[PDB]
Amino acid sequence: FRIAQDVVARENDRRASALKEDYEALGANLARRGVDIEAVTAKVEKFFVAVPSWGVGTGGTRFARFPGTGEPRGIFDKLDDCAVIQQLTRATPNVSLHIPWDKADPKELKARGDALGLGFDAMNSNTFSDAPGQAHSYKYGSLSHTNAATRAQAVEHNLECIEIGKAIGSKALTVWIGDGSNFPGQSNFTRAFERYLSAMAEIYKGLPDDWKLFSEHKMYEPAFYSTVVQDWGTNYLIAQTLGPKAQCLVDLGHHAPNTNIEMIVARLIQFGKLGGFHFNDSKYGDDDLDAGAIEPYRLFLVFNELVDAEARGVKGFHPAHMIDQLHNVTDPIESLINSANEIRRAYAQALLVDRAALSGYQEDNDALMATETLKRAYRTDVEPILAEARRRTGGAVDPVATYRASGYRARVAAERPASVA
Amino acid sequence: EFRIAQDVVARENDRRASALKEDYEALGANLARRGVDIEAVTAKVEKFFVAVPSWGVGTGGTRFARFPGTGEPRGIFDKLDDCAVIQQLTRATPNVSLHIPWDKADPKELKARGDALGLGFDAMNSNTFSDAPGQAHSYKYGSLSHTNAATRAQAVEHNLECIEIGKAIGSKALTVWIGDGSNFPGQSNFTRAFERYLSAMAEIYKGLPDDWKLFSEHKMYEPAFYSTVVQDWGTNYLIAQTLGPKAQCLVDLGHHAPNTNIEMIVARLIQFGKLGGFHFNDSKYGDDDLDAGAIEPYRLFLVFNELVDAEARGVKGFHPAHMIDQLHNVTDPIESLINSANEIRRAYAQALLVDRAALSGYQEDNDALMATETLKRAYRTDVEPILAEARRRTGGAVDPVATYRASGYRARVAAERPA
Amino acid sequence: EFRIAQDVVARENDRRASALKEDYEALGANLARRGVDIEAVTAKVEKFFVAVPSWGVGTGGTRFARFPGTGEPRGIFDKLDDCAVIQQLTRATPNVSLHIPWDKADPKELKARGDALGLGFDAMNSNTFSDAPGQAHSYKYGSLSHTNAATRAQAVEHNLECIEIGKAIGSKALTVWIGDGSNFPGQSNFTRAFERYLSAMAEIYKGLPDDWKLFSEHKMYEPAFYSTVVQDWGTNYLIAQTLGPKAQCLVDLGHHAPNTNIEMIVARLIQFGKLGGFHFNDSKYGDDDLDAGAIEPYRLFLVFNELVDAEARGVKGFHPAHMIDQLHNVTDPIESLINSANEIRRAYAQALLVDRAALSGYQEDNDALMATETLKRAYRTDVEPILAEARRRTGGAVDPVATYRASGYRARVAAERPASVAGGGGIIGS
Amino acid sequence: FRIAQDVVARENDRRASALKEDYEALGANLARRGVDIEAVTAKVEKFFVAVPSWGVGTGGTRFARFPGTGEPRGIFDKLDDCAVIQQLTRATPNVSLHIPWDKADPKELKARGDALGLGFDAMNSNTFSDAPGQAHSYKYGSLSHTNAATRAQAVEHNLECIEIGKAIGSKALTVWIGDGSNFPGQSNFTRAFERYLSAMAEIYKGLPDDWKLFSEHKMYEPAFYSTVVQDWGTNYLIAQTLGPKAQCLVDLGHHAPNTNIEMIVARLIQFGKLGGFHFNDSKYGDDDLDAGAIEPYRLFLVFNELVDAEARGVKGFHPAHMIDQLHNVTDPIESLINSANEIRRAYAQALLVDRAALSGYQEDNDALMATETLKRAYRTDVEPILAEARRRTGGAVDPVATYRASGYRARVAAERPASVA
Numbered sequence A, D: 001f002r003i004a005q006d007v008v009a010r011e012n013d014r015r016a017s018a019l020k021e022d023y024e025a026l027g028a029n030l031a032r033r034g035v036d037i038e039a040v041t042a043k044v045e046k047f048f049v050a051v052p053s054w055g056v057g058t059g060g061t062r063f064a065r066f067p068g069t070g071e072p073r074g075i076f077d078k079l080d081d082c083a084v085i086q087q088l089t090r091a092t093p094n095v096s097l098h099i100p101w102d103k104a105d106p107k108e109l110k111a112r113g114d115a116l117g118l119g120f121d122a123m124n125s126n127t128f129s130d131a132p133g134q135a136h137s138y139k140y141g142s143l144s145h146t147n148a149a150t151r152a153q154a155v156e157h158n159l160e161c162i163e164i165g166k167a168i169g170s171k172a173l174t175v176w177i178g179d180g181s182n183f184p185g186q187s188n189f190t191r192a193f194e195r196y197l198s199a200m201a202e203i204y205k206g207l208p209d210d211w212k213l214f215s216e217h218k219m220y221e222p223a224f225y226s227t228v229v230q231d232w233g234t235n236y237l238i239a240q241t242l243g244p245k246a247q248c249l250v251d252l253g254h255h256a257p258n259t260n261i262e263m264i265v266a267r268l269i270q271f272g273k274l275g276g277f278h279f280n281d282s283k284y285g286d287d288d289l290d291a292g293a294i295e296p297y298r299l300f301l302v303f304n305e306l307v308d309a310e311a312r313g314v315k316g317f318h319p320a321h322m323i324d325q326l327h328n329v330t331d332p333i334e335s336l337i338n339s340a341n342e343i344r345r346a347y348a349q350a351l352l353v354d355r356a357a358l359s360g361y362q363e364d365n366d367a368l369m370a371t372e373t374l375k376r377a378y379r380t381d382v383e384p385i386l387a388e389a390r391r392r393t394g395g396a397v398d399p400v401a402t403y404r405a406s407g408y409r410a411r412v413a414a415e416r417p418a419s420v421a
Numbered sequence B: 001e002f003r004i005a006q007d008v009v010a011r012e013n014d015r016r017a018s019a020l021k022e023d024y025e026a027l028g029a030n031l032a033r034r035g036v037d038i039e040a041v042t043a044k045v046e047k048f049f050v051a052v053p054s055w056g057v058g059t060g061g062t063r064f065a066r067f068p069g070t071g072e073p074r075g076i077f078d079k080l081d082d083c084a085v086i087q088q089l090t091r092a093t094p095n096v097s098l099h100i101p102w103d104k105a106d107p108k109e110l111k112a113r114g115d116a117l118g119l120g121f122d123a124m125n126s127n128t129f130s131d132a133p134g135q136a137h138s139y140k141y142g143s144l145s146h147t148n149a150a151t152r153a154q155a156v157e158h159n160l161e162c163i164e165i166g167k168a169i170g171s172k173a174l175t176v177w178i179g180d181g182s183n184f185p186g187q188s189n190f191t192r193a194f195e196r197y198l199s200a201m202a203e204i205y206k207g208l209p210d211d212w213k214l215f216s217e218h219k220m221y222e223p224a225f226y227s228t229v230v231q232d233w234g235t236n237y238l239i240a241q242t243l244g245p246k247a248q249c250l251v252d253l254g255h256h257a258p259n260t261n262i263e264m265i266v267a268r269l270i271q272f273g274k275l276g277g278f279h280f281n282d283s284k285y286g287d288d289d290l291d292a293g294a295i296e297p298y299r300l301f302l303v304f305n306e307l308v309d310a311e312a313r314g315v316k317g318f319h320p321a322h323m324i325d326q327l328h329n330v331t332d333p334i335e336s337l338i339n340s341a342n343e344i345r346r347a348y349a350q351a352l353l354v355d356r357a358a359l360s361g362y363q364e365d366n367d368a369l370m371a372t373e374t375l376k377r378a379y380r381t382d383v384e385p386i387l388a389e390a391r392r393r394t395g396g397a398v399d400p401v402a403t404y405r406a407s408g409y410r411a412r413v414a415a416e417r418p419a
Numbered sequence C: 001e002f003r004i005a006q007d008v009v010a011r012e013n014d015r016r017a018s019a020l021k022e023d024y025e026a027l028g029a030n031l032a033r034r035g036v037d038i039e040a041v042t043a044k045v046e047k048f049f050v051a052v053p054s055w056g057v058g059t060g061g062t063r064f065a066r067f068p069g070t071g072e073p074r075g076i077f078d079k080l081d082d083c084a085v086i087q088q089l090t091r092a093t094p095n096v097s098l099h100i101p102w103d104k105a106d107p108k109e110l111k112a113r114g115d116a117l118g119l120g121f122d123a124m125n126s127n128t129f130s131d132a133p134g135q136a137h138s139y140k141y142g143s144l145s146h147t148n149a150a151t152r153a154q155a156v157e158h159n160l161e162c163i164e165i166g167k168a169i170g171s172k173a174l175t176v177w178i179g180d181g182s183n184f185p186g187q188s189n190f191t192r193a194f195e196r197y198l199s200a201m202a203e204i205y206k207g208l209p210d211d212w213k214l215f216s217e218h219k220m221y222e223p224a225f226y227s228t229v230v231q232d233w234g235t236n237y238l239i240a241q242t243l244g245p246k247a248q249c250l251v252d253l254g255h256h257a258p259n260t261n262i263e264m265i266v267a268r269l270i271q272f273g274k275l276g277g278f279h280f281n282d283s284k285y286g287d288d289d290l291d292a293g294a295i296e297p298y299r300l301f302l303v304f305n306e307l308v309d310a311e312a313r314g315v316k317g318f319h320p321a322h323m324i325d326q327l328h329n330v331t332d333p334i335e336s337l338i339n340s341a342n343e344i345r346r347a348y349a350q351a352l353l354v355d356r357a358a359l360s361g362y363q364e365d366n367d368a369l370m371a372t373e374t375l376k377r378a379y380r381t382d383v384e385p386i387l388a389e390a391r392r393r394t395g396g397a398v399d400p401v402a403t404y405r406a407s408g409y410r411a412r413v414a415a416e417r418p419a420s421v422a423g424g425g426g427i428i429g430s
């Protein structure tokens, strides 16, 4: 137990009365609306989202990085920190690894995970930066580099990520590369994409029977003129071309200004290529901010599409849910805690939508009542449901408050040496 | 008079009275636990008013098509009758915003009708972005900033006429939004055009009553697709400052570049005393003029957070004009305006719930996470019980759209008005 | 038939012949030093054509207002007469794109008129984004994707009639752009709406002649302000791919999200054989429908660079349809279309000047700077002498707009046609 | 001479003939247009733009940095490379320094600049990153930080930049900070701006009589929710509030999508607050790409406003011009060379605009002819004028070609140790 149980007990007890009052009030209100709050809570306590190992330490921008105290010095410290998020929220049992950042002996990783009560989500490869001892630089590309030897090196790296993942329990590989160009003419758009397609086809061949291969699109950055996998259209072409095991991963902050992201989600589901999500919030570019901190409604609208998918009986639809954020000005553990909470919040509200009524308003083109039907769910304060879900599963009624009360940060600050060079 | 029968209102309120009582009491207990007196919030909410646009009462259209519904208002008088319904049911829209010459009519009559319906009039709106039949000079290439002196004079004269109409009905401000700009590089000399605009606005200001305000409204684009004279809040500030103390800037939410932090523009204008008022609506792409809060309700809340903070900081003489500027292309105009008015009160109400003392502490300590969570605790609060009770206590409807539909008002005016 | 007097064209050409000779010869010597035969370029340029929109010769407007100029064309016939002028002077717009029902008229008369004027017809354009007189079902909530079956059937039938009119006049394709979508979250079920659209398009597809094509045109927003069924090239690809071989995607330059790399979309559509054609225009904010290349000339060149690269390395009967889709609210429609057509040929000619061998080398080399400079060397080249000489050799004018004004054509049609009146644009009702 | 004169002479002679033909042809064409090419060339020779010291080294993104060979380490190495750009283009006589990146003994800096034939443009302060031993972190801001001591430290830093600048010949200080927030509520917009204005007032008082203080606005990054100096409106408020010596600096890539930047330029000029420019190109955000490599017409349109401003004889108009770019996939020296070249290209074309004709078409609302008047100048290939101006002032006809012919890159690569090589 990273967090003392007596502390979780104390803080939960301190807030029990208020929770009881709020939950019961919400329960009665929902009952009057024909909704069984217990049914919603039962589903909420089972919604899980993977935590990114690279989001447990303080992030930075191209301008600067401002680390806080007790920064994890490696993957093992990071797993320890992830154990806190899971213990308090009970919504993040799995961790997303990034190779070579989290490169370590597979058995050790697995041993630490089991010891902490954590599993492992999709593996993430890294061919957007050079590691020591590389025969080829990824400066001008990786899987789509004009140099065949460079593409071969990148492929091998991805295959290695699969080997690591199989050893620890992962069942998928997410591939995001920075490949693209910063000047018109630098790249032949089509040849670059063909090179990429050939490389991914090879990686596809090393995929176990029950594995998935996710390609993640991104409009720009690091490439500032064109990117090979720039949007969901190119992404669909990739998934369709590679095969059944290949699907598309949607990272919320990777779209052009004003893009209707929830529609992209609906389109990918309709064609069975919605592999998973990378949750975060943003206002300008790929800001990688705490989920829902900027546009909570958009997050709800995305979950509205996910729940509608179930409502329509979409077969074998099991998207992977993951947080992909950077925390530059907050305690990473606290931001990941509240971000996971926000995601469960959007999910819970999505479950409250009266889709029978909505179905009717859409059929009769009653736009005003249709939008009001969604709003009736989104406006509902489901915090009591999230808190009760946590209480029932061993978590904290108020996770960040309990986190601060434990003094975990000061503790790890004393155990961990700050990076000097 | 009462456009909506009172027995209907009473009936539809009693039908929901029990549920409301339960929700209001529960929220009240929750707010008490948070150190807030729900009664004090309701009191302020029932006092928050936003003006309804005359041009949003009838069905709107795009450059591609217009799909009118039944019972479309024939003119300003029908529109006032319909505005009376919005006010009767929401009790949040006692004033109507007129647009000339769309609403041209005998001022005395308009006032007589407003008085009979229990409606007042907000800022007048001039129109020199379109030509009227028998117009001597066309605004095709501009109006207040047109290169032709006679055309600028005509635009100025039209604005003065708007003021004369406003004085006859009780309006105390004039809002100036023009399409002036260019669609091609080189078409206009940016500086010269702005110089002409400033000179013309100077003449309008000269004719502005001393108990009136002059609001200029910036817009990034449309109808001008390359450059626009009053393109953003920066130019807008230069205008207000140049004209004088009676001139201020009006912020229309959908008139900003993609990803613009609009609440910051609001805060900046308040700091320098030039925030005249708002034109509320929502959008996702351009100046969509959609129902307020229907797309990004948190943004609306964040704008009101700046307004409330201004009061909390102790800003004096700050009374921004609140107006809705929307077009309803695929819904019953009355229903959209009803819920839009409600949404604005919703954001305002939530803004009132913000624990300013706690927020101040987190800001000073650079506790970004708790600062933002402090705003979220207010925003996440479902204040519908408060909005509904305020309505019920002031003669409105617990659920206005439901009551509106139960009344059969639309079918009624549909029979009274030509198809 | 010459809408513009031949002596006027001759006069205006002779007056600028001396200067053109000097510029053409200097550019010829420069290209020669660069290993390029100016005649080869001029020969290709003279053969590049782009269709003119019938709805473009009339003055356009916005939702706020419309400001018609003098001599506004009454109907399709007046518009065809005006299009004949653009073609006579630029020699780059022999085909006109029709829009139904705006230009509905006896096919035999249209066909007869086009021939007399030396004009053909490009793709037909259906209109189910507006209601017409006596229409049984309104398109307020959609057309091909409307929830009401009878409404979708009515829209399908309209499109089939467009195919019928086109078959009679010599058209070989149908372009389908609709406003279908929603203004509020929840109003539409994205998937169901798209399924209905696909099923409706399938019925229209069944009505296509063997040598016809069906072009679906995506647009991010407007008239729908929250979601649009055919919102981008991704959904557009799914459509074309689903319908069949005769279905392809049409790209309108101003229909993309801010900062989108449009030339890449073109390449992707080419790679997968679904590049149906283009709707050329320029913009800075949204679907501004401004004169092509008047705002971002380089972007137009880069789009043509992809086309020429494909045109170079011979591609699958690669013959995308080129059309101009613009609205002119502050200029003489005829003059803007003239210069817009010219700009399109300018970008094309410049793309022709790119040293493909050199470019390929720099790309394989990862020599970004030289690769981009290779494009710039072609783009920086002032090809106006080629464009002018191409027009002069084919019966056109050296300076089209100059000749147009010298002819007094506008004053002439102004006297023959009823005067127009300015007014609103539909933002509100009567 | 960083580049052997014999090399410059040989590469000039090699291209002298073609240059003569093109220059004469252009001279004849311009003559027919009532313009004397000699006059344009004379003006172009005198147009200068400052080269960034941080632009000669390879740039990178938050994802990775891919250094090239012969990466300059320290300001002395950087100055040596800047000298090559000036020698070959003759358009970058002055260098922009950034403190503390380029910290060194002022006397020694001046001596080096003099020896290399380089002057110094505006100084640049840095309170958007923490330096070793720093007493107060800038994690939550600097000049607008809530902590008084932190703001004072930031002020002191800027004052030191002024001291260094005065010793080396600089006459201005550019202030760009990352100050802002990543979360709504994190900052009180008004108070933060009040703190900034008060701090800037202190810096303003340390300004010599002949110095200027430039504030640089930016929409976002590093702050992803709000930025204190977010746009030109706030920037104007700052300059007007501070006084006559304070003006606004415009960095092309710092604006919202679709913003009409040339209008902002015109507005600042009209009110005497156009302090200077930070030239670069972009497509998505603050990409910092080579000037004009993405949107050359926009660059021309900006210069059209500058040339018009002089034509009108506006007073208080005397902006500084600087390049602020990052080169992640090209030889930094070649990019700066061609970027300085594009800037002169835009200036040259703006010089060709027939102002009289333009004025007439504007007054008569002939939009088509007015825009065509701009195009006639922009469509003109002024490369002959740029090449001749260089040839006449000791530069290279084709700078990048000569640079490559000289073998300079391999030279410094052999003198400088790479991290790994």
Ligand SMILES: O=C(CO)[C@H](O)[C@H](O)[C@H](O)CO
Binding pocket: A054, A124, A176, A216, A218, A251, A278, A286, A324
């Ligand atoms: O979103 C991403 C890049 O913008 C990818 O998912 C990365 O692998 C992840 O963010 C780690 O940098």
Ligand SMILES: O=C(CO)[C@H](O)[C@H](O)[C@H](O)CO
Binding pocket: B055, B125, B177, B217, B219, B252, B279, B287, B325, C427
């Ligand atoms: O927002 C506006 C134009 O976009 C102005 O306020 C108008 O006067 C109003 O919308 C009426 O069209």
Ligand SMILES: O=C(CO)[C@H](O)[C@H](O)[C@H](O)CO
Binding pocket: C055, C125, C177, C217, C219, C252, C279, C287, C325
């Ligand atoms: O681009 C279009 C709508 O924005 C379609 O092509 C239309 O059919 C055309 O523009 C006519 O409005």
Ligand SMILES: O=C(CO)[C@H](O)[C@H](O)[C@H](O)CO
Binding pocket: D054, D124, D176, D216, D218, D251, D278, D286, D324
């Ligand atoms: O533009 C800037 C930051 O984006 C400032 O000018 C910086 O000081 C410069 O780029 C150095 O990073």
Ligand SMILES: [Mn+2]
Binding pocket: A176, A216, A251, A278, A324
């Ligand atoms: Mn991601």
Ligand SMILES: [Mn+2]
Binding pocket: A251, A253, A254, A286
């Ligand atoms: Mn990302």
Ligand SMILES: [Mn+2]
Binding pocket: B177, B217, B252, B279, B325
């Ligand atoms: Mn408005």
Ligand SMILES: [Mn+2]
Binding pocket: B252, B254, B255, B287
């Ligand atoms: Mn508007």
Ligand SMILES: [Mn+2]
Binding pocket: C177, C217, C252, C279, C325
């Ligand atoms: Mn189109």
Ligand SMILES: [Mn+2]
Binding pocket: C219, C252, C255, C287
């Ligand atoms: Mn369009």
Ligand SMILES: [Mn+2]
Binding pocket: D176, D216, D251, D278, D324
């Ligand atoms: Mn800068």
Ligand SMILES: [Mn+2]
Binding pocket: D251, D253, D254, D286
């Ligand atoms: Mn920058």
